[PDB]
Amino acid sequence: MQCPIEDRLAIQDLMIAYAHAVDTVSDIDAVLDVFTEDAVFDLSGIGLTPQVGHAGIREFFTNVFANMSHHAHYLTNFAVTGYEGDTASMRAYVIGMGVGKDGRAVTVNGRYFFEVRRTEKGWKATRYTMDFLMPLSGTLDNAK
Amino acid sequence: MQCPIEDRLAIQDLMIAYAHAVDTVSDIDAVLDVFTEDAVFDLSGIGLTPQVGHAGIREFFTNVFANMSHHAHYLTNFAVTGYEGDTASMRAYVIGMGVGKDGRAVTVNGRYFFEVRRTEKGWKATRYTMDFLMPLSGTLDNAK
Amino acid sequence: FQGMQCPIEDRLAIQDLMIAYAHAVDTVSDIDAVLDVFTEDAVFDLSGIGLTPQVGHAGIREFFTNVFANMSHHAHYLTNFAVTGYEGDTASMRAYVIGMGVGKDGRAVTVNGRYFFEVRRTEKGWKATRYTMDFLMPLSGTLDNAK
């Protein structure tokens, strides 16, 4: 079945909201609000240890936010890759830029893969994975 | 108040029209058509001198277009941040690239903030501000 | 006199076709998926960024057989989508591209440019009948792995 335009834009907006929360370099609560409590936050596709649940996502961003100075996550090329009414999936391209407090830059040219579920507070992410389109530029050490 | 999809897309289109006008590196009338007659064009958030009104905005671009050779303003991550019916607010990320006639490059990784009004000729910008997501690469001297 | 307004469903369908084209290019392999974007008769004319024009599926297939043979990685980011024309069963759309690649020879390329798609409604949906490009910034790298 076809994804309603309303839901396509909602899911895009969730992803853009996640980018905004990361790009604060501070607002963990805003990051967590994107995800269900049980969410799989699995960035093993770019070489980072998987995390599950809000506690794991919090740990991840406590570290990232402590280590990073500036961030910008540009999301483009949104495509609905599945829709089953109460659940959906969406792909986007990312230009994920950062500079650490240690001065070291990073740019990821890759893809975000979101799985989402319709909840009483809107669409939320149940699973998030990634991969590369280009070889990593710089370092992911400040996210480890 | 939720912004209708038709208006959301119209406001995005306006912002993309602005980027197109800037990227002509010549069409000041097209730039001015984005803006209300009394619009605030305030780029102080990226270090430039603010202007108010079409005369000011024309001055700003007479200089920029005199000094620049090539422009590209990629806009992404659009988000409605306010909607009051006849007024609205939208955020976008920009990758703002330029090369001067003097050969000096600039890239702004930042954000646009548009405030818009519904007019007899469609949505138009009443205020435009910016800030950075990453430290400025290159120079904004060709826009001063 | 207002031109005929492009319906939202069609605007999104045409955007999606262009994003599908980028996806196909970014497989660095799937010529069939690339060709699915175009009418059999399509004009594939990238002379605006310095490449030789092609016409039809045969020509597009030749083009990508070469590109895919020479390239290691691709990323084609498309942004600033704008409907530039709509006549009902035909339309046109502009997009900005950040077209990135690295060759098997290790040479990088980045195109900062624009895509211009002219599309037609078919029984299998909107398809591209003409595709052209130009630059917003001076080419970074070579398009020799696309030549």
Contacts of residue A72 in chain B, CB cutoff 8 Å? 93, 109, 133-134
Please state, as a whole number, how many other Cβ atoms lie within 10 Å of the Cβ of residue A138: 15
Instruction: Return the structure tokens found at B97.
Output: 């690239």
Q: Do residues A9 and A85 lie in contact, with contact meaning Cβ atoms separated by under 8 Å?
A: no
How far, CA to CA in Å, does B137 sit from each of A102, B23, B75, B106, B141? 18, 19, 18, 6, 12
Domain extent listing, chain C:
7-147
Other C-beta atoms closer than 10 Å to the C-beta of B104 total 15
Tokens 């006008």 sit on residue: B21
At B118, list the tokens: 């519904």
Q: Which pair of structure tokens corresponds to residue C112?
A: 């900062």
Q: Which of C80, C137, C138 comes nearest B19 by C-beta?
A: C80
Q: How was this structure determined?
A: X-ray
Q: How far apart are CA A23 and CA B92, in angstroms?
A: 13
Q: How many A×C Cβ pairs under 8 Å? A: 36
Q: What ranges make up the beta strands (E) of chain B? A: 35-41, 51-52, 68-83, 87-100, 105-119, 122-132, 137-138
Task: Report in angstroms the alpha-carbon separations of C82 from A142, B103, C59.
Answer: 38, 30, 27
According to the CATH classification, is domain C7-147 in 3.40.50.300? no
- Chain C residues touching residue B19 (CB < 8 angstroms): 80
Helix (H) or strand (E) holding B13: helix B5-23
Contact A92, A15 (CB under 8 A): yes
B71 contacts B94 by C-beta, under 8 angstroms: no
Comparing CA positions, the residue from A74, A92, A71 lying closest to residue A11 is A92
Is A79 within 8 Å of C20 when comparing Cβ atoms? yes
- Which amino acid would we find at residue B113? F
Cβ–Cβ below 8 Å for B133 and A23:
yes
Q: Inform me whether the C-beta atom of residue C77 falls under 8 Å from chain A C-beta atoms.
A: yes
C-beta atoms of B77 and A13 within 8 A = no
* Six-digit token string for A66: 């402590």
Element (H, E) at C124: none
Of A129, A99, A105, nearest in space to A115 by CA: A129
**Architecture of the domain delimited by A4-144:** Roll (3.10)
Burial of C116 (0-12, 13-18, 19+ CB in 10 A): middle
DSSP A86: S
From B24, B33, B129, select the one nearest B73 (Cα to Cα): B24
Which residue in the set C19, C74, C100 is minimally distant from A77, CB to CB? C19
Please, which residues bridge with residue A99 across strands?
Answer: A70, A105
C-alpha dihedral over B143, C96, B115, B34, to 10 degrees?
A: 70
- The C-alpha atoms of residue C147 and residue C133 are separated, in whole angstroms, by 16
d(CA C93, CA C126): 12
* Residue pointed to by tokens 């995390």: A51
Does any CB of chain C come closer than 8 Å to the CB of residue A2? no
C73 at interface of A, judged by CB pairs closer than 8 A: yes
Contact A76 B76 (CB under 8 A): yes
H or E element, residue B48: none
**Six-digit token string for A88:** 């959906």
Angle at CA of residue C36, ends C35 and C40, nearest 5°: 65
Tokens of A33: 């609000």
Q: How far apart are CA C12 and CA A108, in angstroms?
A: 27
